[PDB]
Design a protein around this ligand. Structure first.
Ligand SMILES: *[C@@H]1O[C@H](CO)[C@@H](O[C@@H]2O[C@H](CO)[C@@H](O[C@@H]3O[C@H](CO[C@H]4O[C@H](CO[C@H]5O[C@H](CO)[C@@H](O)[C@H](O)[C@@H]5O)[C@@H](O)[C@H](O[C@H]5O[C@H](CO)[C@@H](O)[C@H](O)[C@@H]5O)[C@@H]4O)[C@@H](O)[C@H](O[C@H]4O[C@H](CO)[C@@H](O)[C@H](O)[C@@H]4O)[C@@H]3O)[C@H](O)[C@H]2NC(C)=O)[C@H](O)[C@H]1NC(C)=O
Ligand SMILES: *[C@@H]1O[C@H](CO)[C@@H](O[C@@H]2O[C@H](CO)[C@@H](O[C@@H]3O[C@H](CO[C@H]4O[C@H](CO[C@H]5O[C@H](CO)[C@@H](O)[C@H](O)[C@@H]5O)[C@@H](O)[C@H](O[C@H]5O[C@H](CO[C@H]6O[C@H](CO)[C@@H](O)[C@H](O)[C@@H]6O)[C@@H](O)[C@H](O)[C@@H]5O)[C@@H]4O)[C@@H](O)[C@H](O)[C@@H]3O)[C@H](O)[C@H]2NC(C)=O)[C@H](O)[C@H]1NC(C)=O
Ligand SMILES: *[C@@H]1O[C@H](CO)[C@@H](O[C@@H]2O[C@H](CO)[C@@H](O[C@@H]3O[C@H](CO[C@H]4O[C@H](CO[C@H]5O[C@H](CO)[C@@H](O)[C@H](O)[C@@H]5O)[C@@H](O)[C@H](O)[C@@H]4O)[C@@H](O)[C@H](O[C@H]4O[C@H](CO)[C@@H](O)[C@H](O)[C@@H]4O)[C@@H]3O)[C@H](O)[C@H]2NC(C)=O)[C@H](O)[C@H]1NC(C)=O
Ligand SMILES: *[C@@H]1O[C@H](CO)[C@@H](O[C@@H]2O[C@H](CO)[C@@H](O[C@@H]3O[C@H](CO[C@H]4O[C@H](CO)[C@@H](O)[C@H](O)[C@@H]4O)[C@@H](O)[C@H](O[C@H]4O[C@H](CO)[C@@H](O)[C@H](O)[C@@H]4O)[C@@H]3O)[C@H](O)[C@H]2NC(C)=O)[C@H](O)[C@H]1NC(C)=O
Ligand SMILES: *[C@@H]1O[C@H](CO)[C@@H](O[C@@H]2O[C@H](CO)[C@@H](O[C@@H]3O[C@H](CO[C@H]4O[C@H](CO[C@H]5O[C@H](CO)[C@@H](O)[C@H](O)[C@@H]5O)[C@@H](O)[C@H](O)[C@@H]4O)[C@@H](O)[C@H](O)[C@@H]3O)[C@H](O)[C@H]2NC(C)=O)[C@H](O)[C@H]1NC(C)=O
Ligand SMILES: *[C@@H]1O[C@H](CO)[C@@H](O[C@@H]2O[C@H](CO)[C@@H](O[C@@H]3O[C@H](CO[C@H]4O[C@H](CO[C@H]5O[C@H](CO)[C@@H](O)[C@H](O)[C@@H]5O)[C@@H](O)[C@H](O)[C@@H]4O)[C@@H](O)[C@H](O)[C@@H]3O)[C@H](O)[C@H]2NC(C)=O)[C@H](O)[C@H]1NC(C)=O
Ligand SMILES: *[C@@H]1O[C@H](CO)[C@@H](O[C@@H]2O[C@H](CO)[C@@H](O[C@@H]3O[C@H](CO[C@H]4O[C@H](CO[C@H]5O[C@H](CO)[C@@H](O)[C@H](O)[C@@H]5O)[C@@H](O)[C@H](O)[C@@H]4O)[C@@H](O)[C@H](O)[C@@H]3O)[C@H](O)[C@H]2NC(C)=O)[C@H](O)[C@H]1NC(C)=O
Ligand SMILES: *[C@@H]1O[C@H](CO)[C@@H](O[C@@H]2O[C@H](CO)[C@@H](O[C@@H]3O[C@H](CO)[C@@H](O)[C@H](O[C@H]4O[C@H](CO)[C@@H](O)[C@H](O)[C@@H]4O)[C@@H]3O)[C@H](O)[C@H]2NC(C)=O)[C@H](O)[C@H]1NC(C)=O
Ligand SMILES: *[C@@H]1O[C@H](CO)[C@@H](O[C@@H]2O[C@H](CO)[C@@H](O[C@@H]3O[C@H](CO[C@H]4O[C@H](CO)[C@@H](O)[C@H](O)[C@@H]4O)[C@@H](O)[C@H](O)[C@@H]3O)[C@H](O)[C@H]2NC(C)=O)[C@H](O)[C@H]1NC(C)=O
Ligand SMILES: *[C@@H]1O[C@H](CO)[C@@H](O[C@@H]2O[C@H](CO)[C@@H](O[C@@H]3O[C@H](CO)[C@@H](O)[C@H](O)[C@@H]3O)[C@H](O)[C@H]2NC(C)=O)[C@H](O)[C@H]1NC(C)=O
Ligand SMILES: *[C@@H]1O[C@H](CO)[C@@H](O)[C@H](O)[C@H]1NC(C)=O
Lengths: 451, 139, 40
């Protein structure tokens, strides 16, 4: 029939590929307080108008565990964190023999009054000053106790910059020309599969890099009852993400009144030591509405029912094994790093079909190197004044019940073992694709004969 | 309508619009002219990801737009060719494909020999056709 | 009493800046040179 080929430029077709994305956010820190650790001094401004199209008739398949936007997220934060510590005061002189004592047992003691010998501005002379340090950040050596920083044994140390905000602000991921990000608008989205409701937004929603452990904060929640996502259910080993439908409110506060003591160690450099405490020593705490918590824990076991042995016994235990900083709900707040005992939230068990409020004990660490990074650790200077955080808790992280071969019951204890899963709680619905505008198709049409 | 608005509709509908996809292909509001405007080191991790993304932007646009120029179709968005359609590619009939397959499905149906079509495309429409002036350019 | 490497003892900083430590090490010839009974 003399069918001829004809070309079409701009054909809507795409193939799964992952390119380099970039930052987007509008007016945030600006003049009053800037120098955010994440948004740097400048990010490309987000457009006030968000573009979302409800791609019709399309049923593209998503995958949130094999998605590379979460891995791009991971290596970006690490390189972003290290870039915000590289130009600052290194605390190599802080490795000396430390002679420390308790505080007001009054013969209650979890911090120590440390005296030690340290270089001054002039290299020739030396100076002795006191400083307070939290427990575990220091360890004994061999009448008068003698201590040493826990990191001087291992890797180097560098002080966090004094005027740097560790507050997570929304960072937008958006595609490059010829690319598009596909959004899963399907409310129920068990693990990953063909999503009937797709959109091709140019820019994701407001994603906050909430550095959290075991429990997630300030995240996104779909409208249906709490969602459960696993790369593979029944592989007891793989961890479990949990999206709520309504977030719980947990407020935390450090009652300690830390004074700022700046002592120079050479020129320009100034170490910011904990001063002398004002007021009676009070342990840091977290409040959880016991009423609000009991129902959130219940809706999960209802959704987990249809995914684990139907009707049977589901228990919750305290973390289970591991290290002290990964088995507690670690996070950052105002600049000081909390580690709260989660054993008080994962102890109840329900099966077979003005107000009291739970509180959680928390300890504080000033020496940190996150993401299991053994390269270089950092000292977080004590935040002068009062501390109070008030963030929603939106996500969870669960783990194994060992290796019970079939049998009687199932238990899930928390274990935020990795940091990249935290962003997977925000990126389950997204996936980027490569537009291919070149399509060829036949039609009985040919151009002029000679030319 | 909208960007890829007809991605799921039949091929006859994508034939009808098509520009909305072609328009939003090179430049974006997302790029937004860089600079903070309104510390003095722009070597940050963000500047590296942006610039390498602005490069592949025009690198992928010009790689495809170079193909339109060697086929005599540079000036227009849809041009006809003098390459006959070979039945081994598809057995389906004229109205059977344009109303029942959608483009998304079609790209998977030709992806095997798609490069072979491109080879024959440079020949009949621009290797011979632009040469045919020899006799007709002046006698 | 065949000799082209030397058993070197020297004084070097440890992990803690305050304290010092003495350990031995071997070095090849020419990589080290004398200064001015006990060689230095
Ligand atoms: C999950 O999300 C939640 C919610 O976002 C998040 O919690 C927030 O955490 C951030 C820090 O990470 C908090 O922000 C800090 O707030 C510090 C305390 O001050 C706060 O409250 C002030 C109250 O002001 C009212 O009342 C006063 C009188 O009391 C009155 O004068 C005011 O007009 C007003 O009525 C508030 O003002 C203040 O911030 C604004 O205004 C002040 C001036 O009024 C200005 O100075 C600020 O710059 C700002 O424009 C603030 O909200 C604050 O100290 C801190 O740092 C600033 O101040 C220090 C003090 O020296 C400076 O050194 C530094 O340079 C900064 O300027 C910072 O602003 C925030 O409050 C939390 N929640 C709220 C309520 O939004 C969780 O962290 C997230 N999850 C995680 C992962 O943690
Ligand atoms: C973390 O650790 C750091 C470690 O530094 C802590 O910081 C330290 O905190 C302590 C708190 O005790 C401070 O000690 C203070 O020292 C000042 C200055 O010293 C003057 O007074 C001394 C008085 O003697 C002390 O001890 C006797 C024992 O009974 C007490 O009765 C008395 O009240 C005092 O506490 C003098 O010895 C010193 O000598 C010279 O002046 C004297 C003046 O007259 C004093 O002594 C006479 C008797 O001789 C008394 O009658 C008279 O009333 C007066 O007390 C003179 O006589 C003598 O001959 C000399 O000329 C100084 O004058 C004191 O004023 C405070 O009372 C207290 O003892 C440390 O100074 C401080 N560290 C530093 C940096 O210096 C830190 O607190 C901790 N963390 C916390 C929780 O903050
Ligand atoms: C954690 O610890 C910190 C460090 O102490 C606490 O910070 C201070 O706490 C106190 C108590 O809560 C606050 O309240 C009062 O502030 C008053 C004002 O002082 C500031 O302004 C003064 C201007 O002039 C004022 O004082 C003069 C006398 O010098 C008067 O003639 C005049 O009328 C004014 O009243 C400045 O001169 C001064 O430097 C301050 O910038 C203080 O006057 C008042 O002092 C009383 O209490 C003191 C102990 O706090 C005591 O030593 C004094 O003798 C006096 O009895 C008091 O300080 C402060 O505003 C506050 N800030 C600072 C920087 O000091 C912090 O509050 C605490 N957290 C908790 C839990 O409260
Ligand atoms: C824990 O969770 C509670 C409950 O959600 C939070 O309390 C809510 O906090 C949110 C945000 O912090 C508030 O949410 C929104 O406020 C909007 C403000 O109005 C307009 O202007 C702003 C600024 O330009 C725009 O960003 C915004 O889009 C609006 O144009 C409301 O308008 C929003 O309501 C409706 O429209 C938006 C538009 O897309 C939708 O996205 C919303 O789903 C909604 O349909 C929205 O309300 C909110 O007001 C607070 N209350 C409630 C009950 O939600 C805590 O803040 C939160 N804590 C943290 C830190 O997670
Ligand atoms: C900081 O850096 C210093 C120096 O590098 C480290 O060394 C110690 O420093 C402290 C001072 O903070 C020394 O203790 C002091 O010693 C004074 C005199 O020492 C001399 O005599 C001692 C015995 O005392 C007799 O004589 C004194 C003379 O004043 C009389 O007052 C006494 O009554 C006695 O008769 C000897 O032991 C010493 O070797 C000297 O010959 C003394 O007057 C003070 O009261 C105080 O005791 C200490 O000796 C230094 N060395 C040691 C062994 O630690 C220091 O460790 C660094 N940081 C720390 C951890 O503090
Ligand atoms: C484009 O054109 C290419 C060919 O150039 C097509 O390539 C074919 O791709 C498919 C799918 O990827 C290949 O399928 C193969 O699947 C294997 C698993 O099962 C296969 O073998 C089973 C039994 O094998 C016996 O019989 C087969 C019959 O061919 C023999 O080849 C064997 O030797 C055995 O005797 C079959 O029942 C079953 O159907 C499968 O054939 C897997 O192990 C292979 O790696 C492979 O994936 C297929 O082999 C490829 N081509 C050929 C002819 O070998 C491509 O699909 C075309 N694309 C489009 C869309 O047009
Ligand atoms: C490493 O760093 C050190 C210190 O900075 C450098 O200095 C030398 O260190 C060595 C130890 O490795 C010293 O030698 C030792 O000295 C001991 C005692 O010294 C004191 O007395 C000496 C005389 O000895 C008498 O008293 C001792 C007391 O024990 C008796 O045992 C003897 O029998 C004598 O009666 C004096 O010369 C000295 O000044 C002291 O007053 C001694 O007991 C040991 O046997 C040994 O000899 C050495 O003195 C330090 N200084 C010198 C001059 O080098 C060292 O150089 C650095 N690295 C090197 C190269 O080793
Ligand atoms: C998991 O949760 C269960 C409850 O669902 C919990 O069992 C309860 O533990 C608490 C605390 O250990 C018990 O309360 C104690 O009861 C004894 C008498 O049996 C009292 O003597 C105790 O009083 C002292 O301590 C109090 C603070 O704990 C002080 O306030 C008080 O003044 C006294 O000094 C205390 O009341 C409680 O009896 C049990 N049982 C029940 C049914 O409540 C279990 O421990 C949790 N497990 C974990 C590891 O989370
Ligand atoms: C989310 O929902 C998805 C849609 O249902 C789930 O995808 C399904 O996953 C299962 C398991 O991976 C796929 O295959 C199943 O295979 C079992 C095993 O069949 C064999 O053994 C049984 C007896 O045990 C026997 O009767 C059979 O003959 C076989 O010998 C079957 O029993 C199931 O019927 C089913 O075939 C599904 O094909 C797959 N559905 C699809 C196509 O989407 C997904 O697992 C859910 N979870 C997550 C995390 O995504
Ligand atoms: C977190 O700390 C805050 C205080 O900083 C606690 O917030 C307060 O919670 C009480 C709960 O009864 C609220 O009381 C009631 O609030 C309603 C409105 O929701 C109001 O209509 C009533 O008159 C009464 O005030 C109180 O408002 C609330 N304060 C604010 C402004 O949030 C909170 O409870 C702590 N978290 C936990 C674990 O409870
Ligand atoms: C199409 O081209 C292939 C490869 O040259 C050839 O094998 C086939 O017979 C052709 N079919 C026709 C007749 O168009």
């Amino acid at each position: 029939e003399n069918l001829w080929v004809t070309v079409y430029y701009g054909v809507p077709v795409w193939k799964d590929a992952e390119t380099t994305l970039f930052c987007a956010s509008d007016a945030k820190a600006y003049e009053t307080e800037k120098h955010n650790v994440w948004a740097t001094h400048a990010c490309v401004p987000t457009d006030p108008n968000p573009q979302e199209i409800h791609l019709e008739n399309v049923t593209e398949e998503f995958n949130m565990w094999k998605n590379n936007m979460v891995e791009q997220m991971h290596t970006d934060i690490i390189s972003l964190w290290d870039q915000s510590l590289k130009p600052c005061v290194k605390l190599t002189p802080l490795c000396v023999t430390l002679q420390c004592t308790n505080v007001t047992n009054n013969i209650r003691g979890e911090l120590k009054n440390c005296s030690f010998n340290m270089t001054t501005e002039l290299r020739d002379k030396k100076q002795k000053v006191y400083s307070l340090f939290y427990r575990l950040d220091v360890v004994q050596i061999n009448s008068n106790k003698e201590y040493r920083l826990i990191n001087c044994n291992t890797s180097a140390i560098t002080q966090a910059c004094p005027k740097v905000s560790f507050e997570p602000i929304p960072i937008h991921y958006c595609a490059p020309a010829g690319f598009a990000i596909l959004k899963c608008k399907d409310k129920k989205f068990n693990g990953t599969g063909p999503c009937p409701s797709v959109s091709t937004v140019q820019c994701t929603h407001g994603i906050k890099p909430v550095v959290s452990t075991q429990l997630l904060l300030n995240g996104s929640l779909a409208e249906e009852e709490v969602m459960i996502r696993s790369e593979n259910i029944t592989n007891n080993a793989k961890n479990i993400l949990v999206q709520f439908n309504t977030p719980v409110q947990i407020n935390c506060t450090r009652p300690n009144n830390n004074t700022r003591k700046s002592i120079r160690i050479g020129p320009g450099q100034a170490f910011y030591a904990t001063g002398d405490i004002i007021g009676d020593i009070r342990q840091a705490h977290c409040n959880v509405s016991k009423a609000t918590w009991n129902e959130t824990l219940g809706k999960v076991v209802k959704q987990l029912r249809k995914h684990f042995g139907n009707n049977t016994i589901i228990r919750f235990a305290n973390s289970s094994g591991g290290d002290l900083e990964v088995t507690t709900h670690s996070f950052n707040c105002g600049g000081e790093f909390f580690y709260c005992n989660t054993s008080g939230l994962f102890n109840s068990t329900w099966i077979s079909n003005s107000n009291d409020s739970i509180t959680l004990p928390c300890r504080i660490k000033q020496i940190i190197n996150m993401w299991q990074r053994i390269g270089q650790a950092m000292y977080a200077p004590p935040i002068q004044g009062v501390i109070r955080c008030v963030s929603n808790i939106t996500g969870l992280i669960l783990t194994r019940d060992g290796g019970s071969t079939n049998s009687t019951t199932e238990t899930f204890r928390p274990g935020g073992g990795d940091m990249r899963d935290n962003w997977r709680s925000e990126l389950y619905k997204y996936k980027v694709v490569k537009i291919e505008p070149l399509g060829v198709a036949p039609t009985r049409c040919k151009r002029r004969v000679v030319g | 309508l909208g960007f890829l608005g007809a991605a799921g509709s039949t091929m006859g509908a994508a034939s009808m619009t098509l520009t909305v996809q072609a328009r939003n292909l090179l430049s974006g509001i997302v790029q937004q002219q860089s600079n903070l405007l309104r510390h003095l080191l722009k070597l940050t991790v963000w500047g590296i990801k942006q610039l390498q993304a602005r490069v592949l932007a025009v690198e992928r646009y010009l790689r495809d737009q170079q193909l339109l120029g060697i086929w005599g179709c540079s000036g227009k968005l849809i041009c006809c060719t003098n390459v006959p359609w070979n039945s081994s590619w598809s057995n389906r009939n004229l109205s059977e494909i344009w109303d029942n397959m959608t483009w998304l499905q079609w790209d998977k149906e030709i992806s095997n020999y798609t490069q072979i079509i491109y080879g024959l495309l440079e020949e009949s429409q621009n290797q011979q056709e632009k040469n045919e002036q020899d006799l007709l350019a002046l006698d």
